[model samples]
Target chain A: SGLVPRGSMGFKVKLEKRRNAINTCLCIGLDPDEKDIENFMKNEKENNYNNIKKNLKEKYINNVSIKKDILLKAPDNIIREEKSEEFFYFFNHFCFYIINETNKYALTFKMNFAFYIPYGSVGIDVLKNVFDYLYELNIPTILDMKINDIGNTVKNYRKFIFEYLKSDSCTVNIYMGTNMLKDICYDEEKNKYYSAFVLVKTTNPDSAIFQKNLSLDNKQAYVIMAQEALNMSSYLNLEQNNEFIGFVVGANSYDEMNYIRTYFPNCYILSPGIGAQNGDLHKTLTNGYHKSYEKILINIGRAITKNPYPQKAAQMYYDQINAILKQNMES
Target chain B: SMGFKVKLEKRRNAINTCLCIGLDPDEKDIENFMKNEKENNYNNIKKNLKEKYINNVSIKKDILLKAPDNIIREEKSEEFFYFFNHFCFYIINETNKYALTFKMNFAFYIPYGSVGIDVLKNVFDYLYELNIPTILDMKINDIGNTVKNYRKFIFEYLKSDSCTVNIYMGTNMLKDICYDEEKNKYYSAFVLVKTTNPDSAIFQKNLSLDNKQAYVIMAQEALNMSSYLNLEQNNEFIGFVVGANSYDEMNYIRTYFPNCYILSPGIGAQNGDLHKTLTNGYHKSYEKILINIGRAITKNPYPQKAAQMYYDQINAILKQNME
Candidate 1:
């Protein structure tokens, strides 16, 4: 009797897991206000500062320090009273809804950093609360830090976010050079805490000015060079749990995404700027990430959130994505 | 008698004033603090407390709140202390050595907000104790209650030697700012006549009494009001902002209001193109101009030597302009 190959056995197990998991490829961005959640909790039940503080200390304090000095200086009592708990619950509810609604879809939630930074110390408190809630729900959280810095600076940032914040994954700007990737993916021992998708081609018009500039040594622009860098780094650091999620293939660039996909076969692709920027959803689905487009996340920022009814708007996008996936499955 | 006009001779006398320097500390400056590895002792005192109580979970919150301000000072973080001390030392040394007025922009400390307010107070106290004339660039502007609160802060809380107020909001705002005029309570308002920045036109546009589109109309109004108003002698300082970028406009403003004190910016880094500004951007008779150079002096490879060079250049420009 011939023994089955370990790699084949692992691959079979992974495929089986993926088959059982949610098939819906949608990740709603949850940038919540801590104050808003607190008020929501108060309205739901009774206003008890002691219980709320206890909950925050127990669940959130390990990951972050919401000490009195931080509270006194930054002054985020309003955020604590309003949105902290409710925001997490909404996210958990959304993830549950995604699993129940789609049956086989995976959800991705993008957290914008600016919404938190203004709150200063309290902002860090709210982020920890959100992180704990998401981790418990088993939903993949993508930190939209857009961290652009030099090598040493990038190292400190990686330590702060991956080690301190404990984010599931993050988005990194590719301008900092390829070697800086070592700072983010340090070891295979702690694989789950660190992962990043490089920004190669952005959807914004001004993005082309810098990203598409021809390098002095080579004819290739920085974006193409970044893609090559990602590929090389991923290949080299394969043993270190380094996953080179294929660069941010903007939804507008269907042809470009197709070209990138041809080069990087197995790598995951993240395509932002779908709804608000008027990206063709159908074109994005068909030509972007081959037929395995379910692995791709079509990021909709203002399109869903800016609407008067976020949930309904999210459902519409959800329906549209499912229709596309079903058509791809049939064909 | 029909057409003869008296040509006033320009007075090129150098005024005795002290240079006020601001020391706004940043995070990277306190990397080697004995208390905490991550916390820059300059701003984050709580971070130090967190490090000390890393083991004891119960005492962390209480200890952080009650931590003394001098803990950072005790940590021997010479970087932050030196940064502030260097600015103060240079300002005191140079101003006493040469006698030049110094002004500090208040917004740099405003980022630290209220805690930063303590830093500002300390800086001002040190300057005042040295008998240096402190020109506080508060850039105060707001309506009713906010303006009143600012007045209390400037006059009562801070007790600044001199304060700068925004003139864009009309003369009534100035009246509201200088609330106690009867007691001869004085403050200097630097009416922004024309900004050095090229993009200033975006917000400076205002409708004139003749229904004509005019920029810096408020500055013009402030100048017109200053002539009639009985300001305390020698204490009243009106700044006509001669933006270095706009030479012809600055010259026109200078020509119209020759008596006003001019504060000229865009000298070094922004490349206000100083030669053209000084040569053609002012009236022939007016020698009173405060040239503000921040990065040109501060970011110089050699700051102290650069400041001396700037001082020499200013004197040289005055001589050339007077001639």
Candidate 2:
């Protein structure tokens, strides 16, 4: 406990401690939609897709003059002062569910930045509030912004997420290559650690369309990204190791994860495609998890959120992952 | 009359230039803009930095150049609003007269968070009021459903002329974004073909099955999407972000899809060869390209003069090239 200050332990340290208590490195993703938020709202039954826009335009979203036509095609919710109440309620409720009911089972919270921006500034504020709440809980937040830009632009993004939003880490679309990202990932000024998990191989079916393309090295594009991320991570020694700069090698491609594991011996592996997202938990745990390695963040968004009993769901994941980790360690 | 392409073209014609000025407003530069108070007296800048609580002699020189004025060191509620409002007003006021369109990059808003977004909204909305065509350099990508929401927000709420979309998701995304039902018009979708950044080769330059680079395939896909738009042949909705620096690659891409609008960044300061990019990228008489100059214009103390100089130089070049 005395090793590092409480306020600014690296995300790895935060997750490491929780995983020690919880016996799992399971992370929960926040990709809340209208139907999910309605699961906890007052008028739950009338919360179908058609009704969400109807009710929101009628009862909420008062600040903006949304045309009925535009409103008709709108997503689950729009961002407004009216939204902050529901936004606050949805996130605060979901967050406390993690804090009190499921905190022991999960180590970190991953919020997809693209999903929340639709609700406008209020949504951004809600995100900040959630970050504050998680900071208080000692649960590190990883913003899944997938930000891909150049040098000066990337610097501001780093400044915003680290200094302003106070996120412990962020997911980056590494298509822009490793050099620009290397400049912003760690801060020498503050002695603070913030990781950028470069997207190595995404778990989606469409991902193979691009990620599976064989690079000149006779390895797939994913392998190239993994090597690049590892190389850049190795370059940044402020973290003592490349553990801070990691890769988002989703679990759907469990067989290929061995390549990332082999190339990146000691870097955080945030495996996102797990549970209901078409990921095989058994394979992800068996093939993906490493004992004397950079740790594996097994993330599940829809699987836990959609469950009627989230606590039980988290416990089930906790048990399954722990059993796998223990068995992997013993062997 | 129709949507993004027509709007962009009309603005281009009106300004007599195909220059899309990128507004990547850095805090350092904005603080440079908000320099009203005496050098050290505006401890407000230091106070805000130290409030979270933190600098050196070198840092002092750096901070002095990039520090916000006390009037804008608005820890006060009213002060913050005017601070941002003034920023939007000054930049827009300065550059609006000369440029064809404004493409506001999303990077500048990161430090400010929700408030920075408000500033972005301020500028975009202010641009909307002035009828200046604006592009959101957000480079957003996602599943079809999330994309629909993004499209609605960007076009309907934000009133932006266009947005740069990451095409790693594929051209299928075009079906979701390109068509607007209410307006019965097609919107602009600038697919990332070949970015000028050095790191672009890591993913973009990967070899395809038939030996073509990944970017070539993306360029073809962008053109294919433009053809699919079923718009007037000359007035295509789908455009490709071909960097100005990649002369040969840009020439290669221009070979096949000359009609599609080419929104080129990496111009100005980093500009490779303007004459070559425009010469190769245009569709004979119809110039379907926009040269984006970000810091080369906006970060300049005399941005208006810089933009005017660029516009005149571009016009002079265009006259010499096409004429």
Candidate 3:
């Protein structure tokens, strides 16, 4: 009856456990928008949109028509019915199918709010469902919101992420400074386990505009963010192996990644920009890690999910990353 | 069928005030209101509620009187949604007269998740029905494609008139979304120049290769984008969110970009100097400046009266400057 561990097990510990079991650091990104899905269907030879629609009507829509009928009884409630209801159900099936297919090879899943939030409330409902399903599998999930605000406002985002959404970790934009960053950090003294990955060095085309510009003190903005992470980790009294605070260092920017890895070796990194974004997997695996593989997670979103055979795509990534690490160890 | 700038100009000229009400729902204010509703009965609750909890807001008559047995009933599932919805609805009704516009920050609504989004849609639709221009202040910054989705959500779906964009992603990505060459229409974006935070200068004050600070470069980019899009200088499509307290930045941007609108915040509760901010923010047209006040007005017992006071103060200053 008391088989499960007691007390709070933070995001890092959960991630470490799964990572060690799987022997991989592959984070599959479920960032499929309507446009991506439409393109996916159109690209496939056998998958026709009309046929898929007909099949969905038989399998999912017919069963929910009774509920629709109940909704129709109150004509006043007509406008109350969200237009995105069917799209919501479609996404549930779409995302669940992908997760069920590719869950084994993935170490974690990252759901970007930008992809879902545009669809209105139904979009959020889908996100909650996916999060709940991932929790049932005992896999860690990161809510990539990139939210930044001050004091009372930031607290509400914390509640929404940890309490409402039940996310294992979240990404916070540290543009508001470390005081706001400290506001988002999990309570290490209380031994609770939640992680916030601060945006240090993004890999976008014009990221260097602000991130690399030298302040009056002749230090780059991203460097300041990295130092702040170290200070926050120390102030929180985080264990060396604990990932209560992490940094979002883009994998494509290996110079910056190496800098963070060399200086702040204790912190974990959630490195995006793996495949389609021109981040070399070998360089990402080598420069991103300090000593242990658990310290870096290489997140590849469209490279794996957009493929026809997602499971194979995911397995290839898992094998490729492991092979690179093994070769590095041999050398 | 008019654009946001035209609608905004019409409203500003009609009201002769540039006070924009910031409708941010704080959890503390919600809890305090819920606490006071427990003590006073619905009849005397109006006066007591007004005196005790101002930002907490008054309950609408129908919702309050319908629940004679339990005043705070019809909750549990959509609890916070109802509280915020009624509170914002009541505040808008009271303060709509004096306010030139309204600003809704997505941070406050995001905590409630889907139900919170439902309230956002409701409130935005209500504002739309009243023909009041609304700014969805999200400080949104992302790559080109992702920013387009946010554009759809803010302008197409919610139909908000304007929004706050972070140009840290560079001006090109912002221009890709704010300007529609195919349609020849510009969606207004108030680019972040000088934010009103204590540590705002940490990243914003960095010197680029040209020795211009980050905010200075962003200010220049905001102006160039507006000019490139062939937008009118006086009612330009691009705008700047300069901090109300940053006197030098306000004067700098106002001097260079005289025609562009300035959406200045931190006027009252954030301790921004009223006369200096208004004086420096104005060029030839007073309609270009929208002073945003959230807690300063909403925290008062009579939000309408507080809004009137701010409106009067701004007009008094404008009158003095007119000569």
Candidate 4:
């Protein structure tokens, strides 16, 4: 149980430090949907308008405009004013609040980049604020672009995630070819220290129609991917201590999850589909899961964000996982 | 052909070229692009991040020590992406002087998130006003619901004339997305029948459940289903991205889809003779073939000369095939 998850420096190092500090494997995915963000902000204003007026009355008695004209505005006027000042406040601090709140239970955070793309220009502004806050907190962020493609395209993608967005690691789609990841993960001339978890088996039910092709050896396409991860880490001279590369295995099936980890035992397992997605947490974590130097990065998306109170939701997730860890500790 | 179909055909005739450049902007170009906007109002939000984010100073004291600056970060902040939008505009305008159409890579614009999307919107808007035709190179694939959202985002919001789609997700994605009854508001698509990428065969070449290979049936199905809908202007809803190498498949698909447009990539590297396949018997009644020389023409020292070279070469070959 005292086995320290290893990586001398870079994402794994920060992630391991987070694990020890927080004592949990949960990662709250910050996926803000465009269809609902405005409504969410509107609701925030409705929840806090009276509270804001009362606070202003108590805190700013010196300002005559607030007591007489400011608080006497119509609901529409208040919302518009609230949207600029209060809504502005929410957009600026909403991601900041969620990150800091979820830090109570989660060791790290995951953000899907696609959710933020539809908002046009404002979306990028919000991302910068959100990602910058995550950065300031020393949180290990996984940028979920699910990117792939070869040639200069992959190199540019690697540069974007690691440099532009400043994410610690990212989820990659390797269906283009197995070797596509090596260009992004390892460098012979330059020492780029980013990490990645290649998509193996997805939690989506329709994934088998494309990703789960089988070979004669009873090993599915995902197992072959795990085998590739073993070879990649070993050949790059990173296999000795830290797990720099990993596989993204879904948490819905323990048999498939356990089966995949066997090949890449040294490689880290970033499991998605916990919470909000109706996945079984206990069975997903306990199935032959404990291994030295390998930590299960549990990712839950809408489960945490869609909650009436996300911070409490995060604590609940942390508590459940922390409870299971105690049960494993006695053995 | 009318509306978007007419506009696309007219634009092709105006330039006498069928070249469509693919723009995959990289951040490596940022240092250079920022310098290009060197003496302009360029504000980068990436500077303070070096110390606070990467070096890992605790936010507990620094952020909470004071309230948010309350600047009301607007999408139009001169701080970032304005330069990116300018960069895309520069490349697009530079290339469009000769090229008739363009295939804008979504990857080029996705990394910057909403900021990137805004930049794309601005660049696309500029192109639209100039009477240029652009295709979003997104290769979009998803379930029915997600596909609907993609339709809204790209076609309704961005107003692209056409887009490249992956057939891996099947033909159902187009059922609701492709309804171009109006002229300028029309949207057509280039289904990936044969990707130019070499590793394409890893999945693309696989045999479908119906006995035929995946690419063949995908093209056939997109062609098969496109008939049920009418895009007007003698334009078909589904076009095929038949790589230069897949001549036989391109020939067969062309027979099945004579009126449908064909977008072939790579002049030097496709099926031994991508030009021959595209022009041999394809351009007589209508200019149905649009060949893309991605990096070759776009990255040339003189894009005007490069596109002119391809235009002349295509015309020469096209005429030679007849004489």
Candidate 5:
């Protein structure tokens, strides 16, 4: 690789630089649904639309109703075309507005594919444009595709996330094993590094059915996956920050977080299941963080994104995370 | 509740077909398209394109096959959608007689971003109009809320008849997507039991506390979900994805769940023992086994012939067992 400057380095390096500069662990997650979008529109109407009500009020419409009209008018090409235009207009406006408001407080943004993918290609276009906007803003991103296929197909997903979507990183399922990480995460021709956060332990209650209950090689399955990921990183000879393999242990599982941090210290962790999932943020911050707060990206989605004052919510999270870090340092 | 199983059964019986033609066009297909256009529009792109373009046959052969990262969304517009849609439509048109269903793997379409998605929707909608069932092979497994979003994406947005799912998230994934007892209506999802990949056993074959392997546990849980959803009285909405290469496991699953449908993939290119796989996976009562041949059929020069041959081969094996 060329001597990439610290500021301009890939996901790990830039995140670390930002973490060192400002003691923040907030990674705002954006998984906007119809209800969330409707709430956002209603809030905008009440709070901000009063001054510019004459000019842009009609334009700031909800996409849910627009899409519902299209669905009802299905088999009609004319109605479908017109409504799709309105849907994309609102979707693009809402996402850009949210990111612009909260980008200042977040170290990175995690955009779930499930939300954007339902709108067909047009929604994906909006997602791509949002990624481009974030890229211009120099904000790191994790495209939470949770992609899992055989090695050959997984390579395509790699291309989709890294090459097409141009996301800084992604969350992948560990069902297919960790053998394909090297091929999927690294772009040798371009000399670009990308992170693939392997799902070690998810936040859902039923996740334990396979991850925690099953035994592989005489140990818990998630444990085997985490160790295998670490071994894969070591086999690839990835550097400290550029390990190219991160673990996604849920924020709700404090004991698992403690175990992962203690045993596998080299790799970074992206812990979801915070905020809206009822995961304890205080305990998660206490157990999830390694010596430095740079290693973990705590994902908070609907709680912050759906909040009436997103910027203030993000600022509060930023301050709260700092307060926890300061308290830990003192103790 | 829209009768996905009944439609598939009627089509399978009418056509005497257990073949599911997989429409998973990849990066390699893009290169093949360009190369084909350069070589005088060989692989039947002429059917979709104008006569002038076909007669002229001037292609950008010098366009250096841009890097995957270089193919941005803006560059992928109408032309990509047109080619991809026609390519898939041509295959469907050619192979529809032999195929009981069509599978569109989400991974392959997603790389092209919006254009890929547009092609997927176009093809699925086209198939819907023809009364043909389509499987959106997403292998989706997530939390209940996220899985609900995927349910909407698959059923509401694409309006696909079926989808593939990873049962690792447990039966709750099914509860969210496939079955809603309150509504008394559901979509069908094939749970990944024993996949065809080489490293499938890395996690799938792991032993659980009850001495049953993970794949076995998935099958059992799938059966439980089916029974709880009252699929036996309504229609079989839960299916299993058992790799054709693993005939023994397939046989075990068939014996356990004789009425359930199985979608097998390791047939042609992966070099599965097709006869053995068919015998083990097939149920005489239901005829509920679908052989998914993706690369073997899609990469062929003549997809119609390839599909016909596979369909005949499967029927021949079934006939031999009967005789």
Candidate 6:
């Protein structure tokens, strides 16, 4: 059966219209901790107390806080509790920055759950709080949970992550049988609550070990599974609300991204590993399929956060995104 | 290089001493959530009653008609925090119950950072409450302010009985995490010599300078400065992380730092290839090794059931050495 039916063809048309309006694809990777920003401000006089405080309270309230004293003296438990508030403050500030800066654009904030979870219970609270903040921001928050499971477990995961977490989107693995997506697709009411980005291709070198395996279906593992998933997801017509983005084909993997784009032309591509992971941003934008040019969200993590100026870095990326979009449109 | 035979003997003895059981559970294990309700239990009636009453009436009534002390304890108990507490409860109970040491992976708990500090505190508190020693497998490496922050978290917040830190960063990174001599507080940093993952060579290779490697330099310094750092007489300053596959490297590390504790991972699912690791991975005098197993025990058809199998497997491995 064809993935898309006659009834849902109009929705795809609407999606195409929305895609045209969105010209810039800018998804900044915000890994803000209190210490990193504070250190940055200390070096740059222009980043004042007011701006920092505003940003902290607004954008990075849910961010991780690094306390030098706690690391040196206090026990792990004590350090975690003590730094939680400050860390959360940074977390909130990150969300605020994303929402405020990209208010006009279709923004995707990649939340790496690892950074917060090491702190303990407070980190969960931070994640939830960040989710809440994102909800308030009314922006699409792509939870990069990168969760992989099997069968009923994957089904349950969809329920918990989409319904409970209330995330706008998420990235998942297709190793758990492509047919298993039916569990997510059938749940029409909740399906609208979140979107799924199957792991078509990943940026990490080791990803090929499993993702590129030759499946019994006589196709390269990732490709065959991705096509099957795309077919299934399309059959379900679950993207009624503009959810259900495509795989995490790495930004560096321009040719692979292009290949996936050819098969699934209209799906939203959530590309990661842009900056810190040695991914080429220029290649990612120019090569990746974007009918309206803004349908893609390029994720940059450590590069921006680890840089001397995070905000400035984000702005530069933002400018680059627009420049690419404009150039693509004119051409 | 000594063979896995020696390293296995050391790991067996260390397991006997520390009695570490790696217990990392996810939210799926919990019941009565939006997803699966198969395992949900309302066994603690008092806590449930209090929760119901608190939500319906008010705190005033809750205080007057005090929840039964047992129920109150159960409600406020670490058990109620389901996802966070279950892992610790199982770890503490299984390890101490079995008289084994406990090892916790930092990554497993990392995703729950919103509750991470509290979860870690609860884990440490439960361990302390149960009078069990705990070790944190924090494969952490960073510089300056970041490293300093880690020291605070490791030392002050989580208060793990012991912690393992990556020495691959450099010797200076340990300066911030080391125990303060004047304070009498204990902190031990384990240096990564060989990692379980095959790709570790990419990073571990850089630590080498001229003829000697960086880990060797750190180990030598930690061993020489043991007395100055006020380390316990029997305890050494450096802990060597020798993965299951890297027994030769482990043996080399052990030769230089004989008294140091050797922490090894990848005992179970990642290939329990322990026979080779233990035979070739240690020095003659080195009897301490913490052999960590993750998925083999945790992802089993049954966790407690798997733990028993692991305990048996460990004993069997050790017994084979005797033969």
Which numbered prediction scores highest in DockQ against the true structure? 5
Q: For candidate 4, lDDT tens digit of each residue in A1-331?
A: 5787443466667777777777888878887665345655566567764433433333222222112343334345655665544433444344545564576677778877655555455555566556665665667888876666654567766766776777778877654455666667765557755688877766655555434543324555566556765576666655343437777777786777777655445467888878756468888777536533136878877777777677788888888887877776763
* Model 6: how far residue A99 lies from native, Å: 4.0
- Sort the candidates on DockQ, descending order: 5, 3, 2, 4, 6, 1
Instruction: Arrange candidates by lDDT, descending.
Output: 5, 3, 2, 4, 6, 1
Stretches of model 5 off by over 4 angstroms after superposition: A1-7, A42-84, A187-192, B34-77, B180-184, B285-287
TM-score of 1: 0.46
Indicate which candidate wins on lDDT. 5
Residue by residue across B168-229, what tens digits does model 2's lDDT show?
A: 64566666676665667567768888887787787788646358788877777666666777
Best by TM-score: 5
Candidate 3 lDDT over residue span A1-331, tens digit each: 6698673367767877887789888889988778665554444224533333433343232232113343222222322464424455456556765777688998899988878788677677777777777876777899988877655567777778887788888888766556665556654344453578888888787778777764556667688777776687677655543557788888788899888888787778999888778788888788886546767889988888778787899999999988887876774
Error of 4 at B125 (Å): 0.1
Docking class for candidate 5: medium
Q: Could you give candidate 6's per-residue lDDT for residues A179-271 as a string of tens digits? A: 556554346554343467777776654444334532333545556656766776767766665445477778877777777777778666778
Can you tell me the CAPRI class of model 3? acceptable
Candidate 1 residue spans exceeding 4 A from truth: A1-20, A32-106, A187-193, A213-223, A239-242, A290-294, B1-32, B35-323
Q: Tell me what fraction of the real C-alpha contacts between chains A and B each candidate also makes.
A: 0.00, 0.46, 0.53, 0.24, 0.70, 0.14
Q: Candidate 4 docking category?
A: incorrect
For all candidates in order, the CA lDDT equals: 0.49, 0.68, 0.73, 0.62, 0.75, 0.54
Better of 2 and 4 by TM-score: 2
| Model 6 Cα shift for residue A271 (angstroms) | 2.0
lDDT of 2 by residue, A171-243 (tens): 8876666776665686667755567787877775667766775365687777777777777776776366323
Interface CA root-mean-square deviation for model 4:
3.8
C-alpha-based local distance difference test score of model 2 = 0.68
Ranking by TM-score: 5, 3, 2, 4, 6, 1
| Sliding window of 10 residues with minimal summed lDDT for model 5 chain A | A57-66
